[PDB]
């Protein structure tokens, strides 16, 4: 038996009313499938939603430990194992997901094989093990048949564009996703829908289309019970408030911090967000990570030092950054910081260049402001604001 | 008998060797079709090229008078009348063309009707009688069947984009034209081919892609015996030399002048080209038309006055221009002239704005230069040079 099955059976002997309870939490609407699941090995709910909602309602503090068990004990050729693959990737449970994936690409179900290979391409692109060209080529050679992997093959490209700072392709691509074509796996369709909400929130943020951003993050939160999507919803709301409402932005970052207490990845993410917030508002910054050589963290140190006219320290940090390789992502902020330290307009023109190149219409308000403060001609500021990059 | 036929017979009585001559000039391969044409009323050559080349070889000085007769005597349902519609439009013989068109939209031949209606939409758009939106709607409602009008419906849009200063759609649109699909009318295919040569020459000019421009105009000249296409080929070559080679630009404009002696439109066109050339090079300008209220001519008056620091006179002309309506190209040039008169950077930024909006990467060298003379930061100039309008 499965740890989940063991625990449910134990807890049943002491509380019978759980059955009508669990059945309602699982959507079932008469407990026969619950009974069947508990009493017969290898039995499966029609939708992965059922066992997930049960585990979240009855054993939240154990969700990982149990589901890692359950997922890894599934027949890989089933609909439940494909649903479990998406469950793993969505929660960023990369152990469950990666093992599932190597079991799925070798197996004898065509659908599970296709899922495994596409999600494999997503994981390889995520870790910069293959190029985007190689990802597209591989996806093309798969002759994807299912609507689910038709949608996800576009989704993984969206994630890659988001994390590499290549925002201009995102809008046209996300419009191509059509989730109404998913009819066989409602768990996958609903989770993909949440993904689309968060991604559209991000696209709206990067277009400086801010009310929209927050609305789509609202929809994402209402549509999910997955911690990852809640985390990035609060991150995006708070970030959309970066230039306008200090307390509400910090409030969303602190909410996200509070729901991801034990998870160090999310913790680092919200700490970096609060650090950037305090640097934008030129306040004292207790969120700076002084024991890091990541480009983000060093940039935020330099930003703070620049804010408080600690020019020797800022110059030391920028030397550190000079000895590191930047992607086009990081370069705009690099030139913004150099421009502020050196009192230099040309640097702000370079920063604007790279914000345009990445099609980032949100953060580009930082260099523009500086040019405005330095007395830049108003019509010229309009021009720089409205032209864009090929 | 047609005037053409009358003259051909008259000259035949006096010179027999003309048969083998005309037959070779008409492409024929033997005089059998020539004799058929002369002996049977209303009989047509398989290609309209034949009578055109004959008239050009034997009665050049009369080409219009004869062909107007011939074209207006044609059975409108025939291939020769469709070929003659393209002949009239290509030579800008608006009398022949408009009469042909009203006769062809009324007839019972579906091909001739379609030609007539599409060319009608072209002439109405040319004369600003309908908007581009209305042209597109009417073209769509025509359910075009023939390849010829598939190509020409795009060609007329290209002409409208060129003459309104909306250059950015032109490249993608011209790439959609596929003349190899025209198999029934070789006169129309070859004349369209010349049209595409001239248009691509212009698109390359507007992209500041100059050697390419001259190559396509070179091809246009080699592909034609039609005066209108030679005129605009020489106009475009000379224009491509505007900022580099004064003598060769003037040479091409004077050539165009010399081959279009009696035609007042072409004469005005080359005089305006020479006027602009001399203003770009800040020379004495005998080519200015002081008896005009068109935007071009007034702008060149102001340009000359500004060149020679006659600021009161330039201000007077620019007052006149202020009381007139401009398109985006002409507005970019307006802000260039204002920028030079007032020595004002913001005006040059507006000029850049409208050159970008029209996707004119050639004339935009005028305001940029001035900004450079006023000491504009080079990195900023790089930025303005590389960013574009949405």
């Amino acid at each position: 038996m499965e740890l989940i099955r063991i625990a449910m059976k134990k807890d049943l002997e002491n509380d019978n009313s759980l059955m009508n309870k669990w059945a309602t939490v699982a959507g079932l609407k008469n407990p026969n499938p619950l009974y069947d699941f508990l009493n017969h090995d290898g039995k499966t709910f029609n939708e992965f939603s059922s066992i997930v909602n049960i585990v979240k309602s009855q054993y939240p503090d154990r969700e990982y430990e149990l589901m890692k068990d359950y997922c890894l004990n599934l027949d890989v050729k089933t609909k439940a194992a494909r649903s479990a693959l998406e469950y793993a990737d969505a929660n960023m449970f990369f152990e469950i997901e990666d093992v599932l994936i190597d079991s799925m690409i070798s197996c004898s179900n065509m659908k599970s094989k296709e899922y495994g290979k596409v999600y494999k391409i997503h994981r390889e692109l995520s870790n910069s093990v293959i190029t985007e060209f190689e990802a597209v080529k591989r996806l093309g050679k798969l002759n994807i048949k299912t609507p689910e992997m038709n949608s996800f093959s576009r989704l993984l490209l969206l994630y890659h564009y988001l994390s590499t700072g290549n925002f201009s392709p995102m809008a046209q691509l996300i419009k191509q996703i059509d989730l109404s074509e998913i009819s066989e796996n409602m768990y996958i369709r609903n989770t993909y829908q949440t993904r689309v909400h968060v991604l559209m929130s991000n696209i709206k943020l990067n277009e400086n289309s801010l009310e929209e951003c927050r609305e789509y993050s609202k929809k994402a939160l209402e549509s999910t019970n997955i911690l990852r999507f809640q985390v990035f919803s609060y991150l995006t709301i708070g970030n959309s408030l970066l230039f306008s409402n200090y307390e509400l932005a910090q409030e969303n970052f602190l909410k996200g911090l509070s729901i991801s207490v034990q998870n160090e990845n999310y913790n680092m993410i919200f700490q970096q967000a609060l650090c950037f917030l305090n640097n934008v508002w030129r306040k004292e910054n207790k969120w700076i990570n002084f024991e890091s050589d990541s480009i983000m963290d060093l940039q935020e140190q330099a930003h703070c030092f620049i804010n408080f006219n600690e020019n020797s320290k800022a110059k030391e940090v920028l030397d550190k950054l000079d000895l590191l390789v930047h992607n086009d992502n990081e370069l705009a902020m690099h030139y913004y910081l150099k421009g502020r330290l050196e009192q230099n307009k040309a640097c702000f023109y370079s920063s604007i260049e790279y914000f345009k190149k990445s099609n980032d219409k949100f953060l580009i308000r930082l260099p523009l402001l500086e040019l405005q403060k330095m007395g830049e001609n108003q019509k010229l500021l309009e021009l720089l604001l409205l032209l864009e990059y090929a």
Side-chain angles (χ1 to χ4, degrees), chain A:
Chain A
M1 273 215 308
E2 291 102 319
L3 304 179
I4 178 57
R5 260 170 96 244
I6 300 187
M8 296 170 81
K9 286 184 159 149
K10 264 56 183 310
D11 298 328
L12 251 180
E13 314 164 10
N14 186 80
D15 207 75
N16 287 338
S17 76
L18 278 188
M19 219 126 108
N20 314 313
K21 288 194 205 175
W22 284 351
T24 49
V25 157
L28 294 201
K29 293 179 179 179
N30 93 50
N32 270 118
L34 232 170
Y35 173 91
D36 203 351
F37 171 79
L38 280 162
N39 283 265
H40 301 106
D41 278 6
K43 248 50 168 53
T44 247
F45 291 101
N46 171 237
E47 271 312 336
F48 205 77
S49 156
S50 284
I51 183 149
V52 159
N53 291 15
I54 283 176
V55 173
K56 284 174 176 299
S57 190
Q58 193 78 12
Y59 319 111
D61 290 351
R62 303 175 66 188
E63 177 177 334
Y64 181 76
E65 176 216 357
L66 296 175
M67 291 284 83
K68 176 190 205 281
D69 172 69
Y70 179 76
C71 294
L72 288 201
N73 232 69
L74 288 161
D75 180 16
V76 135
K77 310 170 282 77
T78 59
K79 171 195 178 179
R82 299 189 289 269
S83 298
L85 174 55
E86 164 63 359
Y87 167 92
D89 182 86
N91 288 280
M92 296 178 110
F93 296 160
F94 296 141
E95 218 51 39
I96 306 174
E97 180 185 6
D98 294 343
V99 168
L100 279 181
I101 282 173
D102 256 29
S103 180
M104 301 184 71
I105 57 189
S106 296
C107 84
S108 290
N109 179 278
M110 312 256 55
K111 229 165 274 200
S112 287
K113 197 170 168 182
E114 174 167 293
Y115 282 40
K117 287 185 171 186
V118 167
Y119 274 80
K120 182 80 147 68
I121 290 163
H122 166 53
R123 294 285 285 119
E124 283 173 9
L125 186 58
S126 297
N127 296 293
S128 318
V129 179
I130 61 172
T131 67
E132 178 200 336
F133 179 87
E134 190 61 25
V136 173
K137 174 198 280 183
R138 286 176 43 180
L139 288 166
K141 298 188 116 178
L142 286 177
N143 302 308
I144 293 154
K145 293 311 189 315
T146 57
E148 295 83 355
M149 290 309 96
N150 264 329
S151 300
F152 196 75
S153 68
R154 305 179 160 86
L155 280 175
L156 69 90
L157 284 185
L158 287 173
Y159 291 115
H160 183 251
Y161 294 144
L162 186 53
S163 79
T164 59
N166 182 23
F167 302 149
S168 47
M170 292 186 65
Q172 263 200 23
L173 181 54
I174 199 176
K175 287 175 67 165
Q176 295 179 7
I177 294 172
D178 181 7
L179 300 182
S180 72
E181 296 297 78
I182 302 173
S183 53
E184 287 139 319
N185 198 324
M186 285 309 94
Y187 180 75
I188 289 186
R189 174 214 248 186
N190 290 329
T191 305
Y192 284 9
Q193 191 57 69
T194 297
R195 289 178 179 270
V196 167
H197 290 157
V198 169
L199 281 157
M200 188 68 74
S201 183
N202 275 106
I203 293 166
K204 288 301 193 174
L205 172 64
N206 288 333
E207 295 176 346
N208 198 39
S209 186
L210 313 172
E211 274 121 306
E212 268 87 7
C213 171
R214 291 187 283 275
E215 277 297 309
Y216 278 110
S217 267
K218 259 38 137 128
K219 273 193 280 187
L221 283 162
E222 252 222 66
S223 84
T224 196
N225 56 21
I226 293 171
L227 180 62
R228 176 265 186 87
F229 296 127
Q230 292 162 324
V231 160
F232 290 112
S233 295
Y234 289 118
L235 183 71
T236 308
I237 299 173
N239 276 340
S240 77
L241 301 159
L242 268 177
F243 298 120
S244 60
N245 193 339
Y246 176 84
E247 285 300 327
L248 194 54
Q250 174 182 76
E251 193 176 304
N252 278 272
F253 295 153
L254 288 179
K255 173 60 172 171
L257 240 188
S258 79
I259 63 179
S260 49
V261 53
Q262 273 252 250
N263 187 289
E264 279 177 32
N265 174 44
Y266 303 148
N267 206 276
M268 176 188 100
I269 286 169
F270 287 111
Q271 287 184 328
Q272 283 168 328
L274 288 143
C275 191
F276 190 71
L277 175 72
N278 283 288
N279 279 343
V280 162
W281 288 76
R282 305 185 182 193
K283 298 180 183 288
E284 182 183 35
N285 205 338
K286 297 299 295 179
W287 300 103
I288 301 178
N289 187 349
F290 283 108
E291 302 90 40
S292 168
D293 60 358
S294 75
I295 286 178
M296 169 105 78
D297 287 328
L298 289 168
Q299 281 182 345
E300 289 331 296
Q301 309 188 19
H303 196 155
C304 186
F305 287 145
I306 290 167
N307 282 347
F308 288 84
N309 307 290
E310 316 205 74
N311 294 342
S312 301
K313 294 171 173 265
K315 182 59 178 185
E316 295 180 359
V317 178
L318 292 190
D319 286 353
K320 287 189 176 61
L321 282 159
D322 280 348
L323 298 179
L324 292 169
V325 165
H326 295 50
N327 317 118
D328 295 358
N329 224 350
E330 306 161 317
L331 221 40
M333 202 55 59
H334 174 72
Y335 286 114
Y336 166 76
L337 301 166
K338 222 181 193 52
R340 282 191 58 193
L341 183 55
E342 296 177 6
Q343 294 282 309
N344 182 295
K345 284 193 167 176
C347 291
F348 293 129
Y349 299 142
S350 289
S351 173
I352 288 164
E353 177 188 344
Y354 280 99
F355 278 130
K356 296 290 183 176
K357 212 229 167 124
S358 59
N359 200 8
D360 188 349
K361 303 187 178 180
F362 182 62
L363 293 189
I364 195 180
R365 300 161 59 169
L366 290 163
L368 282 171
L369 175 58
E370 295 304 305
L371 285 177
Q372 199 181 61
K373 286 176 177 187
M374 298 166 87
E376 196 78 303
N377 174 278
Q378 307 84 304
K379 192 73 200 182
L380 174 57
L381 289 166
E382 265 173 63
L383 205 49
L384 290 173
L385 185 58
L386 296 187
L387 296 174
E388 71 204 349
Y389 188 108

